[PDB]
Design an enzyme around this catalytic site. Structure first.
Site, short mmCIF file in Angstrom:
data_model
loop_
_atom_site.label_atom_id
_atom_site.label_comp_id
_atom_site.label_asym_id
_atom_site.label_seq_id
_atom_site.Cartn_x
_atom_site.Cartn_y
_atom_site.Cartn_z
CD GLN A 20 -22.19 -37.08 -10.22
OE1 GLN A 20 -21.64 -36.14 -9.65
NE2 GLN A 20 -23.08 -36.91 -11.19
CB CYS A 26 -23.30 -32.86 -9.79
SG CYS A 26 -24.49 -31.89 -10.75
CG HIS A 163 -20.49 -30.89 -13.06
ND1 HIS A 163 -21.22 -31.96 -12.58
CD2 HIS A 163 -19.23 -31.07 -12.61
CE1 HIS A 163 -20.43 -32.75 -11.88
NE2 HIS A 163 -19.22 -32.24 -11.88
CG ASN A 183 -15.99 -33.33 -10.41
OD1 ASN A 183 -17.21 -33.22 -10.20
ND2 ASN A 183 -15.48 -33.46 -11.65
C1 LIG Z 1 -24.94 -33.04 -11.99
N1 LIG Z 1 -24.65 -34.26 -11.97
C2 LIG Z 1 -25.86 -32.51 -13.01
N2 LIG Z 1 -26.43 -33.33 -13.95
C3 LIG Z 1 -27.28 -32.73 -14.87
C4 LIG Z 1 -27.56 -31.41 -14.88
N3 LIG Z 1 -28.43 -31.06 -15.90
C5 LIG Z 1 -28.68 -32.21 -16.52
N4 LIG Z 1 -28.02 -33.27 -15.96
C6 LIG Z 1 -28.02 -34.69 -16.34
C7 LIG Z 1 -27.25 -34.95 -17.63
C8 LIG Z 1 -27.86 -36.26 -18.11
C9 LIG Z 1 -29.35 -36.02 -17.90
C10 LIG Z 1 -29.43 -35.26 -16.57
C11 LIG Z 1 -26.99 -30.63 -13.92
N5 LIG Z 1 -27.33 -29.28 -14.00
C12 LIG Z 1 -27.08 -28.28 -13.05
C13 LIG Z 1 -25.78 -28.09 -12.46
C14 LIG Z 1 -25.56 -27.06 -11.50
C15 LIG Z 1 -26.64 -26.20 -11.10
C16 LIG Z 1 -27.93 -26.38 -11.67
C17 LIG Z 1 -28.17 -27.42 -12.65
O1 LIG Z 1 -29.40 -27.65 -13.24
C18 LIG Z 1 -30.61 -27.68 -12.45
C19 LIG Z 1 -31.80 -27.88 -13.39
C20 LIG Z 1 -31.71 -29.19 -14.19
N6 LIG Z 1 -32.86 -29.36 -15.10
C21 LIG Z 1 -33.72 -30.56 -14.77
C22 LIG Z 1 -35.02 -30.56 -15.61
N7 LIG Z 1 -34.69 -30.51 -17.08
C23 LIG Z 1 -35.93 -30.49 -17.88
C24 LIG Z 1 -33.85 -29.31 -17.41
C25 LIG Z 1 -32.55 -29.32 -16.56
N8 LIG Z 1 -26.13 -31.18 -12.98
#
Ligand SMILES: *C(#N)C1=NC2=C(N=[C]N2[C]2[C][C][C][C]2)C([N]C2=[C][C]=[C][C]=C2O[C][C][C]N2[C][C]N([C])[C][C]2)=N1
Length: 216
Positions: A20, A26, A163, A183
């Protein structure tokens, strides 16, 4: 009875491991992997679908900032299709939602969620449906630097889902039951892009907490 072991890579239902890049997309990769399996099951063709199409177009998700797989399956269904990687390539940053008059490669008719925390139901879904999108706690250094064996770390937090990956099978290695996880951190991560995670060890890392698969 669901079989003791299932590995969809051996049946040609799983595309090569992707990277990615610098984008937290992800959820997009997990989603297309599940759609790729259903497309193969339904039509006989294995094809790379487009995670960029989802990153740029699923307004309900946060692009490179994270998102939910269900929101992605819902978008494909309402939008009447998802493009192939060839028609809408991955660039690893959010951009405008582009429309390709001939990019449509698969359709989705909805999705189903696996009962929260039920690994047996997850096992059955993998066995009958095919690859399933799952979320886990990948924050531990032991996960990030995994190289081999069946992964299990008591510190994993099943309530800290950060994740999204793809369950493409399950089995047992040296007496230890596991899930075969694809992954999206490239082929150099883990074991050629994959990790075996403990199965039936009390929902280790929350593997069965946010699982779903698309209907085709
Ligand atoms: C993948 N790749 C992935 N990256 C993420 C996730 N949360 C934050 N990040 C990043 C890390 C650096 C900044 C962004 C996720 N989260 C995830 C995984 C699996 C299912 C759901 C989920 O989260 C969905 C909501 C994410 N949300 C976005 C808005 N913010 C304010 C809160 C977190 N995966």
């Amino acid at each position: 009875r669901a079989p003791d072991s299932v590995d969809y890579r051996k049946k040609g239902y799983v595309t090569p491991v992707k990277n990615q890049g610098q984008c937290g997309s992800c959820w997009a990769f997990s989603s297309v992997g599940a759609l790729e399996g259903q497309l193969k099951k339904k039509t006989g063709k294995l094809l790379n679908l487009s995670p960029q199409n989802l990153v740029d177009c699923v307004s309900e998700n946060d692009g490179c900032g994270g998102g939910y797989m269900t929101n992605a399956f819902q978008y494909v269904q309402k939008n009447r299709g998802i493009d192939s990687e060839d028609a809408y390539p991955y660039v690893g940053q959010e951009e405008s939602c582009m429309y390709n008059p001939t990019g449509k490669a698969a359709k989705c008719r909805g999705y189903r969620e696996i009962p929260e925390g039920n690994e047996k139901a997850l096992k059955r879904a993998v066995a009958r449906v095919g690859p399933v999108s799952v979320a886990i706690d990948a924050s531990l250094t032991s996960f990030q630097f995994y190289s081999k064996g069946v992964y299990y770390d008591e510190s994993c937090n099943s309530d800290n889902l950060n994740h999204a990956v793809l369950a493409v099978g399950y089995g047992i290695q040296k007496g230890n039951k596991h899930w075969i996880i694809k992954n999206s951190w490239g082929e150099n991560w883990g074991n050629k892009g994959y990790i075996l995670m403990a199965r039936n060890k009390n929902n280790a890392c929350g593997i069965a907490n946010l699982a779903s698969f698309p209907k085709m």
